[PDB]
Amino acid sequence: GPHMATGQDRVVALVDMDCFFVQVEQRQNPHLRNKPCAVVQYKSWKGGGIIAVSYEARAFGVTRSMWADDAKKLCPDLLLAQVRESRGKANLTKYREASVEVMEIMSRFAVIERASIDEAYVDLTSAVQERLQKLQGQPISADLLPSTYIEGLPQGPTVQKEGMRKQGLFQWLDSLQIDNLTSPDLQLTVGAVIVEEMRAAIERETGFQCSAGISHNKVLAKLACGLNKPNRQTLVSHGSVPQLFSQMPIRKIRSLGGKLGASVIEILGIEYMGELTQFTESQLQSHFGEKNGSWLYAMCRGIEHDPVKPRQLPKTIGCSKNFPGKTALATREQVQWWLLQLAQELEERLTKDRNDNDRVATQLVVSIRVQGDKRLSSLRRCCALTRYDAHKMSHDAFTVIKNMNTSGIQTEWSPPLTMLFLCATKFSAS
DNA sequence: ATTGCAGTGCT
DNA sequence: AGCACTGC
Numbered sequence: 001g002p003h004m005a006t007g008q009d010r011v012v013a014l015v016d017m018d019c020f021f022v023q024v025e026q027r028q029n030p031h032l033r034n035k036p037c038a039v040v041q042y043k044s045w046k047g048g049g050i051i052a053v054s055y056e057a058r059a060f061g062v063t064r065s066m067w068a069d070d071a072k073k074l075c076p077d078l079l080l081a082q083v084r085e086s087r088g089k090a091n092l093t094k095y096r097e098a099s100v101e102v103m104e105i106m107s108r109f110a111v112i113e114r115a116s117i118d119e120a121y122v123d124l125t126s127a128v129q130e131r132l133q134k135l136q137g138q139p140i141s142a143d144l145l146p147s148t149y150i151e152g153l154p155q156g157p158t159v160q161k162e163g164m165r166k167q168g169l170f171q172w173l174d175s176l177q178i179d180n181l182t183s184p185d186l187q188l189t190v191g192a193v194i195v196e197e198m199r200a201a202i203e204r205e206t207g208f209q210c211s212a213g214i215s216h217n218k219v220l221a222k223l224a225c226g227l228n229k230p231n232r233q234t235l236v237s238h239g240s241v242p243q244l245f246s247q248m249p250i251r252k253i254r255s256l257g258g259k260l261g262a263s264v265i266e267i268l269g270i271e272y273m274g275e276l277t278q279f280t281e282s283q284l285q286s287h288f289g290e291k292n293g294s295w296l297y298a299m300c301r302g303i304e305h306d307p308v309k310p311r312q313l314p315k316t317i318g319c320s321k322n323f324p325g326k327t328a329l330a331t332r333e334q335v336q337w338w339l340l341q342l343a344q345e346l347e348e349r350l351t352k353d354r355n356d357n358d359r360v361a362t363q364l365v366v367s368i369r370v371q372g373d374k375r376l377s378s379l380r381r382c383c384a385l386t387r388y389d390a391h392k393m394s395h396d397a398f399t400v401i402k403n404m405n406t407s408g409i410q411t412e413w414s415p416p417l418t419m420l421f422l423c424a425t426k427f428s429a430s
Numbered sequence: 431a432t433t434g435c436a437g438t439g440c441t
Numbered sequence: 442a443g444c445a446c447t448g449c
């Protein structure tokens with residue numbers, strides 16, 4: 001009762017840009033705005049691989065990983081923007097720089113954890129306390145939450161989307177105890193007000209729209225964000241969790257989308273996150289390990305402690321290229337020419353990173369794939385990264401993998417290489 | 431013949 | 442350290 005932790009100590013948000021690479025290309029080329037369009041990399045094989053899709057195009061069934069030729073079958077008027085190609089490979093610089101634009105805006109409001117190229121977690125606990133003391137027990141107007149959904153509402157004793165949103169918001173705000181500055185529901189609500197302001201700043205200053213989730217931890221904030229994408233934000237309160245989880249497939253919770261989540265379903269014979277509450281912590285630890293079992297016991301009750309890490313920059317800088325089918329690299333000159341292409345992009349990005357961020361990478365990770373291996377990687381070796389020089393990095397990379405050339409004669413490479421990967425890591429201040 | 435990125439945890 | 446797993 002009084003000693004049962006409820007996991008309501010923090011206010012955490014997750015901001016996730018809407019169809020991000022599409023918005024970057026639509027900002028640049030107004031002809032693509034408000035159209036079914038997609039972003040594709042390469043073009044020769046089946047029209048290119050789609051990596052991002054506008055919401056107008058999703059209505060036709062176009063999805064990521066689809067070949068553009070196939071997407072055109074569902075959406076003949078689909079417009080396409082191509083990822084830049086430099087040195088014979090896709091180059092994501094435009095999207096990395098657009099990401100920096102958004103992350104720098106978010107950092108004005110609170111410390112952020114860069115979770116991917118287009119999403120960040122925000123710890124708003126402190127910002128909420130300061131806004132709460134400034135309000136002075138002032139009620140929160142619905143006009144301050146013009147794009148916010150309250151998950152689970154309306155409920156109890158209009159057939160249009162926006163009417164429902166407002167009805168749920170009104171029920172939430174009517175029930176709110178604005179007199180108590182330690183009320184978790186009030187704290188989430190102020191958090192949502194701040195996230196409205198953050199999202200308005202992102203859109204004003206970049207043109208980009210995004211969705212957000214506001215809750216008490218990262219997993220619930222991420223889950224909340226997806227509930228009303230695009231261009232909306234969703235508040236998931238602690239009280240909303242039992243009903244939300246009662247029909248929520250386990251795989252929807254971050255970190256349970258793969259083999260572990262599949263094993264939870266199979267071993268326990270359950271389907272939904274809420275069903276996990278019927279197991280003891282020791283039972284879950286016995287099946288999934290001490291760490292996973294404790295995490296699951298708390299998470300199915302809406303409780304998680306993983307902190308928002310103060311990290312705005314990526315901690316690795318990597319470049320990779322696949323050589324599928326008949327393009328697999330089969331000669332030494334080939335392997336050496338492509339390692340140089342990769343090393344030259346990496347040098348360009350590393351030099352820019354050092355100037356911008358006052359740090360230097362110290363380790364070079366070299367990874368390859370050989371034809372036949374189903375694994376993403378077939379070998380990974382690390383060597384020292386002492387100079388930002390493409391020719392040196394490419395020469396060193398060749399040195400650590402040259403022993404894998406099984407061909408008796410040097411000039412040939414066997415079995416052929418279907419992937420080259422270079423990654424700079426182990427940053428130190430400079 | 432998805433591709434090209436990333437971070438965390440195990441051992 | 443090298444690898445499996447999981448997420449954009």
Ligand SMILES: Nc1ncnc2c1ncn2[C@H]1C[C@H](O)[C@@H](COP(=O)(O)NP(=O)(O)OP(=O)(O)O)O1
Nearest residue numbers: 016017018019020021022051052053117118230449
């Ligand atoms: N498997 C992949 N391979 C290459 N690029 C990818 C990728 N998955 C995503 N990207 C790139 C392209 C994506 O635009 C960007 C962000 O990833 P998301 O947030 O999963 N997808 P989006 O933001 O487009 O749509 P919304 O959030 O509205 O659902 O990362």
Ligand SMILES: [Mg+2]
Nearest residue numbers: 016116118119
């Ligand atoms: Mg995302």
Ligand SMILES: [Mg+2]
Nearest residue numbers: 016017018118
């Ligand atoms: Mg996104």
